[PDB]
C-alpha cells in the first residue's frame with residue numbers, strides 16, 4: 073500500500089544552502105494502480121525536471137530503510153550516485169553515528185544532493201540541519217528556520233527539534249513543533 077499522507081505532500085522543497093534538495097520518496101510504476109496520474113512521482117519525473125533546468129544531482133540519499141518504493145536503478149542509470157542510509161528506527165531521531173555517516177558521505181560531493189525519507193520532513197530535515205551546523209558553520213537556529221521555509225512546515229516532530237538544540241545550541245531554546253497545515257490529515261478516514 074502507498075504510504076499515508078503522501079498523495080498531498082509536495083514532491084520537493086526549495087534547495088537548502090544551495091546544496092541539498094529535500095524530497096518525499098518517489099514511488100515507481102509498481103504503484104500506478106493506487107496513484108492517479110496527477111499525483112505520480114516516478115524517479116523519471118525527478119531526473120526529467122533536473123534535465124530541463126540543466127542541473128545535475130550528484131547523489132541521492134535514501135533515508136527510508138526500504139526498497140519497496142522504487143527501483144534504485146532508475147536513479148543510477150542517470151549517473152546519479154544512490155545510497156540507502158539506514159537510520160535508527162522506533163521513531164527515534166537519527167543517532168550521532170547516523171549523522172556522522174551522512175556527513176562523511178555528503179562531504180565527498182555545482183550539483184545538488186537529493187535527500188528523502190518517506191515524506192521529506194523529519195529525518196530529511198534533521199540530517200540536512202546537522203550537516204549545515206557541523207560542516208558549513210551555520211547556527212542551528214538558522215538551519216531549522218531555513219529548512220522550515222524551504223520545505224514547509226519543516227521538521228514537525230518536537231523531539232527532533234529538541235535533540236538538534238541539545239546537540240548544537242541550547243535545549244531550553246528549542247522551538248515547539250509548528251502547527252500543521254490542513255492538507256496533512258485529508259486522508260485520515
Ligand SMILES: [Mg+2]
Nearest residue numbers: 100101143146
Ligand atoms: Mg521501469
